Amino acid sequence: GPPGPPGERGPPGGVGFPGPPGPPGPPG
Amino acid sequence: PPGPPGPPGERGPPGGVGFPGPPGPPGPPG
Amino acid sequence: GPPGPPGERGPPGGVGFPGPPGPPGPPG
């Protein structure tokens, strides 16, 4: 018998790195 | 017959860098 | 037959966590 077909696609990666700081607040 | 399907593929790469955070608070009265 | 080869690489993961809040705004 011939080799079977390829397996299913792998699972998604894990989540990425955390983002950078947000914008400064407005003036007081 | 043909053999069974192979094992699942490799896990994908990690996602992208996260978005910038929300804004800071207002500055002080000085 | 013998098992098939591994499947294709998974998709990329989700975006990382948001960054922290920005710093305070300028002094009044």
Cα angle, residue B21 at apex, residues B17 and B25 outer, rounded to 5°: 165
The type of residue at A4 is G
Within 10 A of C14 (CB to CB), how many other CB atoms are there?
15
Experimental technique: X-ray
Tell me the shortest Cα–Cα distance from C24 to chain B, in angstroms: 5
Cα angle, residue B15 at apex, residues C5 and C11 outer, rounded to 5°: 30
Q: Judge whether A26 and C27 are in contact, CB under 8 Å.
A: no
For residue C28, which residues of chain B lie inside 8 Å, CB to CB?
A: 27-30
The answer to whether the CB atoms of A28 and C26 lie below 8 A apart is: yes
Count Cα atoms within 13 angstroms, Cβ side, for B30: 0
Give the length of chain B. Answer: 30
The Cα–Cα gap between B21 and B17 comes to: 12
The Cα–Cα gap between A18 and B30 comes to: 32
Q: Judge whether C3 and B2 are in contact, CB under 8 Å.
A: no
